[PDB]
Design goal:
The structure is a homodimer.
Chain A lengths: L3 H10 L1 H9 L4 H4 L12 H21 L5 H23 L3 H23 L3 H6 L1 H20 L8
Helix pairs in contact in A: 1-4, 2-5, 5-6, 6-8
Bound molecules: (2R)-2,3-dihydroxypropyl (9Z)-octadec-9-enoate (4 copies).
Chain lengths: 156, 155
Amino acid sequence: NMDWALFLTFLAACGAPATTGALLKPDEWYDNLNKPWWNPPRWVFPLAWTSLYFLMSLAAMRVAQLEGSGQALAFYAAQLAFNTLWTPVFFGMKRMATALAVVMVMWLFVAATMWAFFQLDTWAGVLFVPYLIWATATTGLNFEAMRLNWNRPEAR
Amino acid sequence: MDWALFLTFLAACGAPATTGALLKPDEWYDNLNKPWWNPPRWVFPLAWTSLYFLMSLAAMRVAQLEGSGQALAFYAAQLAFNTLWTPVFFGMKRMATALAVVMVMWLFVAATMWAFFQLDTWAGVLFVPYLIWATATTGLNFEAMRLNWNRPEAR
Ligand SMILES: CCCCCCCC/C=C/CCCCCCCC(=O)OC[C@H](O)CO
Ligand SMILES: CCCCCCCC/C=C/CCCCCCCC(=O)OC[C@H](O)CO
Ligand SMILES: CCCCCCCC/C=C\CCCCCCCC(=O)OC[C@H](O)CO
Ligand SMILES: CCCCCCCC/C=C\CCCCCCCC(=O)OC[C@H](O)CO
């Protein structure tokens, strides 16, 4: 069942997006943004991502042990990279429209991963379902951020 | 050659490539203190674009083989820290944090190369220029750190 080398490798890989969160805190810029009613409080985000880093690593560990797992892991690498990209674009460069491009691509690769993961191992795909829900929420949130604050210069 | 695989990896490379097209070296990079052996800015896009193709071809080869899990897990890891680095160095402009990131990148680039050799020799060979380049980047990043140690970028 449990391969600790794989798991600790995928976990370590989450250390890159985890770092973007830890270096780019929400400050006053993010405060004064018009946000949608359903916008979760600050503390929700670190919690959610921390869980998902563990859930997706565990997922990728199961899959990586199976044969024919190349396309799935290629989808996985892709998802992780655009996930690492999103926070430095939204909070770092503060380009909400661009970040929305990024997060939508993130979404497609999260989805492609989930699918490819289901076709090899049902629990692995199951482990990515809460990932796909949070990614959708995030995209919605990125979208409302862009639209409700369109006339500011950070919406580009 | 497996086109589905290759294009997937090349698309993954779109994430670090975006970082670099969006954070083009301007006045700040120009006025940074840099070693004599710092290359002209036009080298950087050429080198990375080459390596995106090379690393994706390498990943295509490996991912077609039985037992590639761990190798591909190294690959996801190096790719992620690759993507983290340019926003830390150029965006945030934090030279010492950038050094830490690039050193972690280099480790995973070396582990990937290593794991690639254990499966597919040409996949390993393809990761050799990537590793040479990662070493030079680490050197460049180290030098910029110490040469600007007394400026706010020593962060
Ligand atoms: C469906 C798509 C299939 C795949 C086809 C699309 C591939 C997207 C990326 C390819 C890399 C090509 C090189 C892009 C140019 C990068 C130049 C750049 O500025 O790099 C910055 C540097 O890498 C920062 O560290
Ligand atoms: C997004 C970009 C990130 C990557 C950027 C960091 C990597 C650059 C380090 C390469 C060292 C090259 C070795 C030295 C090459 C010969 C010396 C030379 O460049 O001299 C310049 C000449 O004076 C003028 O034409
Ligand atoms: C062989 C390799 C062995 C390596 C040994 C294992 C190292 C694992 C380290 C990272 C854990 C990452 C878990 C996440 C912890 C912090 C999450 C976080 O802070 O990120 C939230 C951010 O807001 C979102 O963008
Ligand atoms: C291949 C295995 C990779 C597995 C994952 C690797 C984990 C490395 C563990 C510790 C890194 C600690 C390095 C910390 C670097 C110092 C950061 C620094 O720059 O601190 C300055 C800051 O600005 C102060 O204000």
